[PDB]
Symmetry: D2
Subunit: 112 residues, 4 copies
């Protein structure tokens, strides 16, 4: 998958497991259409989101839903989800995210 997402938990010092991630792609009419989605594995990583054939040039939004994640862990968080927008046009993108109930950090690692 040319797009991968990795999520860590800053409160517990662990991979964030079973985090829902949704990806959208901007359509010709300026709407966000669902493109791909998944849940992080035990390693905090989300593999197999998309493929090189499907991941064409475009404007993409990656949404990470934190509310459900924190609640299963017994936390009611302030930040409920985080979103980031970028253009695809190097050809492997990793979005690495760090989660806390009142803070998020996201970084793009873009490689060959």
């Amino acid at each position: 998958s040319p797009l991968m997402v990795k999520v860590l938990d800053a409160v517990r010092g662990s991979p964030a497991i079973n985090v829902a991630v949704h990806v959208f792609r901007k359509a010709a009419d300026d709407t966000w259409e669902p493109f791909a989605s998944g849940k992080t594995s035990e390693s905090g990583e989300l593999h197999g989101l998309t493929t090189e054939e499907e991941f064409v040039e475009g404007i993409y939004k990656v949404e990470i839903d934190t509310k459900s994640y924190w609640k299963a862990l017994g936390i009611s968080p302030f930040f409920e989800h985080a979103e980031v927008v970028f253009t695809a046009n190097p050809r492997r993108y990793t979005i690495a995210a760090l989660l806390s109930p009142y803070s998020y950090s996201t970084t793009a690692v873009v490689t060959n």
Copy 2:
């Protein structure tokens, strides 16, 4: 204003000046309606976004548009904007954001 936004630049080590910030509020029909917007001042701060009368309970989205900010500074960034969602229901909220072309961090400071 019960909602304030402060933005810093991690590349240049400065307040991020003239950053466009848009705030949306989720409507009864689950749509994001425009609620408030502004640009950061020389201090990187955005004051007067809203008021206690207007800032009622609800689900809010704060969007920070980085593309225009980086371009005026001669940078074409990878992350184009960042969004965070939270519920309003302490009664002063500060969203502090740190900007880089490949990274964003946002933190909520919620006080009385």
Copy 3:
């Protein structure tokens, strides 16, 4: 003070109050000598650390002690303190730090 330190708590979404901050300056013999220290106020800010006369060119280390901070709040943290080194030679420096038991972020805002 040409050097200011501001600390936020990412777990609780608040200023980090009463955080001990120590500043060292590298001596001619390559040793870190105590230069200035203080505790953050209710706003999470540490004012009056030093003065323009005292804050001469040099290599400085800012150390932020998190162990005592987290314990008073009932937390036994993994990261016990964080340190950053920079050279002083713009003329107001703010070190802004964000604290979690398993994570720290520090940013320099350097202005006139």
Copy 4:
């Protein structure tokens, strides 16, 4: 190695390659003695730092030297190195760091 270090570059959106990392362990006399060191590989990762036999309980400091890293890339950074202190006593520790010339973030991921 029960201790691993991974470093990313927030300016360029890449693994930070050839970053010098030094690890110290606090001695009986309260001095920081050199324990282990290495340089990050092309993946931004530093493997083989230590072993389970050598990595006994103690207070450890991980120092990441950014000055040399940024200069080879044509940057003269403000933050010259970052240090974090923790106690070892889960049994695999990953220190993940994100680098910018005016900002650093470090997170501990502690697993089995």
